[PDB]
Amino acid sequence: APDTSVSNKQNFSTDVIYQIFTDRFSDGNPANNPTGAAFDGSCTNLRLYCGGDWQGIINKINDGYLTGMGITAIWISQPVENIYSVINYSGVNNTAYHGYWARDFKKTNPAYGTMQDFKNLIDTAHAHNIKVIIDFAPNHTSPASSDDPSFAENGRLYDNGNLLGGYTNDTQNLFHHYGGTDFSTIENGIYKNLYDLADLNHNNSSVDVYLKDAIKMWLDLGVDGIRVDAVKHMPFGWQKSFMATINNYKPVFTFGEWFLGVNEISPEYHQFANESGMSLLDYRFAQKARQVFRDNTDNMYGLKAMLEGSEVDYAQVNDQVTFIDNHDMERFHTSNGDRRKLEQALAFTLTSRGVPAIYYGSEQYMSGGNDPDNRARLPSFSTTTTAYQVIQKLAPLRKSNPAIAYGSTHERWINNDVIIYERKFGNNVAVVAINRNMNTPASITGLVTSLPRGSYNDVLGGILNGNTLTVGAGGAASNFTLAPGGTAVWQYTTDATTPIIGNVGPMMAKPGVTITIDGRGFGSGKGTVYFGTTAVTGADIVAWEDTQIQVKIPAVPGGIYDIRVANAAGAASNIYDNFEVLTGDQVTVRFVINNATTALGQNVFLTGNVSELGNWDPNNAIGPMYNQVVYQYPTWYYDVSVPAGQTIEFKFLKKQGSTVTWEGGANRTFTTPTSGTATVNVNWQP
Numbered sequence: 001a002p003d004t005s006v007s008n009k010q011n012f013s014t015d016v017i018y019q020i021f022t023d024r025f026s027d028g029n030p031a032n033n034p035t036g037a038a039f040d041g042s043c044t045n046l047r048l049y050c051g052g053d054w055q056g057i058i059n060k061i062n063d064g065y066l067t068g069m070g071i072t073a074i075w076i077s078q079p080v081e082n083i084y085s086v087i088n089y090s091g092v093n094n095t096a097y098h099g100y101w102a103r104d105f106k107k108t109n110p111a112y113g114t115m116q117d118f119k120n121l122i123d124t125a126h127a128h129n130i131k132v133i134i135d136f137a138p139n140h141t142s143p144a145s146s147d148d149p150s151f152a153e154n155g156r157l158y159d160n161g162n163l164l165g166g167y168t169n170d171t172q173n174l175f176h177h178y179g180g181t182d183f184s185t186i187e188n189g190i191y192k193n194l195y196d197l198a199d200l201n202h203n204n205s206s207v208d209v210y211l212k213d214a215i216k217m218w219l220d221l222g223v224d225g226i227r228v229d230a231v232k233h234m235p236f237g238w239q240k241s242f243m244a245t246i247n248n249y250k251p252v253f254t255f256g257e258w259f260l261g262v263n264e265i266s267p268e269y270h271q272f273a274n275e276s277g278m279s280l281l282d283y284r285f286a287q288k289a290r291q292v293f294r295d296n297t298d299n300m301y302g303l304k305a306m307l308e309g310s311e312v313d314y315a316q317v318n319d320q321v322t323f324i325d326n327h328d329m330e331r332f333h334t335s336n337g338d339r340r341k342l343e344q345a346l347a348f349t350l351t352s353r354g355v356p357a358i359y360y361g362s363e364q365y366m367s368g369g370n371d372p373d374n375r376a377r378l379p380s381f382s383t384t385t386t387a388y389q390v391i392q393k394l395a396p397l398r399k400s401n402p403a404i405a406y407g408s409t410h411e412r413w414i415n416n417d418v419i420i421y422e423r424k425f426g427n428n429v430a431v432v433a434i435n436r437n438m439n440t441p442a443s444i445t446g447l448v449t450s451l452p453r454g455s456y457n458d459v460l461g462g463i464l465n466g467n468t469l470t471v472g473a474g475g476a477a478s479n480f481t482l483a484p485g486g487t488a489v490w491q492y493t494t495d496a497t498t499p500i501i502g503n504v505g506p507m508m509a510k511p512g513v514t515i516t517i518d519g520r521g522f523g524s525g526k527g528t529v530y531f532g533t534t535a536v537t538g539a540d541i542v543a544w545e546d547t548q549i550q551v552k553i554p555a556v557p558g559g560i561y562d563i564r565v566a567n568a569a570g571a572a573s574n575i576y577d578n579f580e581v582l583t584g585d586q587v588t589v590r591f592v593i594n595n596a597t598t599a600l601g602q603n604v605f606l607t608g609n610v611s612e613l614g615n616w617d618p619n620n621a622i623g624p625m626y627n628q629v630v631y632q633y634p635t636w637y638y639d640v641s642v643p644a645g646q647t648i649e650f651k652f653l654k655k656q657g658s659t660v661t662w663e664g665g666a667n668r669t670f671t672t673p674t675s676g677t678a679t680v681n682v683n684w685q686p
């Protein structure tokens with residue numbers, strides 16, 4: 001299939017995602033609406049159910065509202081059955097309209113629809129070449145008080161109707177009972193409850209296996225992507241085995257939400273995108289795009305620096321989901337904000353690297369503050385707003401122009417208010433010029449691009465006041481004045497003669513799994529895929545065509561590999577690095593070490609003999625381990641994804657700066673379970 005196919009569930013850079021709060025989009029079936037205190041048909045109480053459902057999204061795909069816009073992926077509210085309680089928080093009544101308060105991950109939320117409505121949504125979306133991404137929130141079930149078992153549904157978790165347990169009298173320890181987080185540390189935020197949500201205990205084998213069985217069920221129903229909620233609040237080791245479960249079973253594009261505020265750059269955030277096996281919502285892009293295009297607290301140099309810097313800091317920048325607002329931010333468009341600002345920011349996101357996500361109602365200029373006011377019902381389904389037309393013209397370029405789906409980003413002209421950047425992938429080029437100043441025209445002189453000579457028409461058709469670009473010899477453009485608020489997109493596409501890899505998904509899997517390599521110039525005839533210097537040819541290449549290769553990961557040792565393609569003619573591609581071949585299936589094991597006293601700045605880490613534990617390398621050791629919530633110093637603990645069903649050797653070490661102190665004695669051995677979790681409780685060997 002080509003890279004742009006609806007069946008490419010592994011990579012979404014050629015897609016434009018439309019993020020839908022199911023309840024707030026279209027009530028296509030009023031018979032499934034909540035009744036009583038849980039429902040507000042006027043949707044003026046934004047914490048109640050307004051009635052929107054999966055039949056409503058089907059109707060909007062069918063009648064061309066979503067497809068007219070060029071949307072090729074929808075991201076909907078978590079589909080699982082939620083609690084039915086209307087919770088009163090100091091006066092306001094609150095319901096599970098948002099899908100985040102699960103009670104059964106194997107059943108649907110009936111307000112949204114039946115399991116048959118879900119399959120009809122999947123099939124209708126696919127028949128219209130729309131991929132379906134669902135939220136999945138495995139961190140917690142629902143508001144619970146162990147002190148008051150009658151509050152809400154006491155966080156109860158059911159397994160396809162069968163009650164597993166609740167928060168009060170949790171003798172099985174399905175949940176964490178350490179109090180609520182104050183967000184002071186990542187550890188604190190992981191093992192304590194978010195607010196009052198009953199925190200699931202992923203170290204409990206029943207919880208571990210249940211959530212992994214539940215995600216496989218939704219993958220069996222044909223979902224094409226997963227947005228994981230609260231990745232900052234679950235153990236990294238468990239989420240890496242969770243990702244290995246998905247990737248070793250049916251790999252689909254998975255990204256998580258790790259919130260970053262304005263100007264916050266976090267190494268942990270970047271480590272998570274680079275090493276977890278899922279990508280992230282690109283809050284670094286979103287916050288800077290809002291600073292430059294919305295709030296004017298930064299200028300185009302800030303924008304250039306984020307684009308240049310993010311291309312390096314994210315190992316796979318083409319997998320990051322970009323957006324200018326979403327459910328956790330005030331809407332981009334303000335009451336007194338010029339609409340041109342929204343239209344430019346959307347033109348910027350749609351032509352930028354990564355996977356653009358448009359929050360529902362952006363095209364209808366919805367404004368609103370923070371939750372719940374950014375989740376109002378969308379007011380109109382008008383197909384003629386300028387913002388609808390901006391998405392309609394630019395979203396198709398993700399499928400048709402590989403420079404926009406995969407290309408590098410090159411700033412070609414800039415000043416405080418104007419950026420002209422170029423996306424390049426082989427000989428495919430897109431050039432985007434944006435003047436954010438709504439008053440001053442920009443005189444552009446000396447612009448050089450990679451466009452062949454010609455008179456390029458603005459793909460936006462002058463609707464954001466763009467113009468034709470005349471390109472002469474050597475990509476030099478004839479000088480022009482960029483209008484106040486002007487935005488223009490110029491492009492050139494042609495065939496790639498060289499194999500060029502633009503994206504690979506999944507990026508972590510065991511031997512035997514088929515990965516998807518997308519790009520251009522692979523040719524029709526089966527060539528060679530290199531994992532390191534290991535050639536994979538012939539029958540292990542499951543599919544080969546010019547834009548997409550599907551190949552089985554060879555049985556190489558676990559570790560990180562560069563991928564490279566050589567077409568049938570021996571021409572080799574660029575290297576696509578950081579592929580992790582896992583040692584096998586994964587299980588999360590909790591390692592607990594007692595009596596590991598440390599100095600200030602000295603932390604305990606774990607390493608061992610499998611790639612998953614850094615292969616005995618102190619620079620790649622797992623940690624720093626935790627030592628405050630589940631166990632307290634000098635006992636340290638950490639949840640680590642390790643190969644299932646085997647004896648690993650490992651040792652703990654203390655690291656402070658450059659100094660590694662290994663524990664003495666013989667290497668430790670442990671035989672990991674085949675599924676479920678295990679705890680290793682040991683004592684520091686001096």
Ligand SMILES: C[C@H]1O[C@H](O[C@H]2[C@H](O)[C@@H](O)[C@H](O)O[C@@H]2CO)[C@H](O)[C@@H](O)[C@@H]1N[C@H]1C=C(CO)[C@@H](O[C@H]2O[C@H](CO)[C@@H](O)[C@H](O)[C@H]2O)[C@H](O)[C@H]1O
Nearest residue numbers: 098100194195197229230231232257258259327328371372
């Ligand atoms: C729990 C959230 O924590 C992080 O995001 C926060 C961030 O820390 C704040 O500084 C920022 O101002 O707001 C964000 C949202 O609260 C984390 O990175 C996020 O992934 C995470 N937000 C998720 C999770 C939930 C579950 O609580 C959603 O909230 C919903 O639940 C509450 C109470 O249970 C309901 O009353 C709300 O109506 C729901 O939105 C977040 O919206 C979701 O984005």
Ligand SMILES: OC[C@H]1O[C@@H](O)[C@H](O)[C@@H](O)[C@@H]1O
Nearest residue numbers: 598599600601602603627633
């Ligand atoms: O500073 C690193 C470590 O040093 C210890 O002295 C301290 O008691 C621990 O709580 C800390 O994690």
Ligand SMILES: OC[C@H]1O[C@H](O)[C@H](O)[C@@H](O)[C@@H]1O
Nearest residue numbers: 047088089090091092093094
């Ligand atoms: O008035 C606004 C209401 O919104 C929130 O849900 C608060 O929890 C609640 O206590 C407050 O009174």
Ligand SMILES: OC[C@H]1O[C@H](O)[C@H](O)[C@@H](O)[C@@H]1O
Nearest residue numbers: 616651662663664665666667
């Ligand atoms: O057998 C004990 C030895 O095992 C491991 O290879 C450790 O790397 C080493 O530092 C330790 O001293």
Ligand SMILES: [Ca+2]
Nearest residue numbers: 029033051053
């Ligand atoms: Ca309904």
Ligand SMILES: [Ca+2]
Nearest residue numbers: 190199233234
């Ligand atoms: Ca948690």
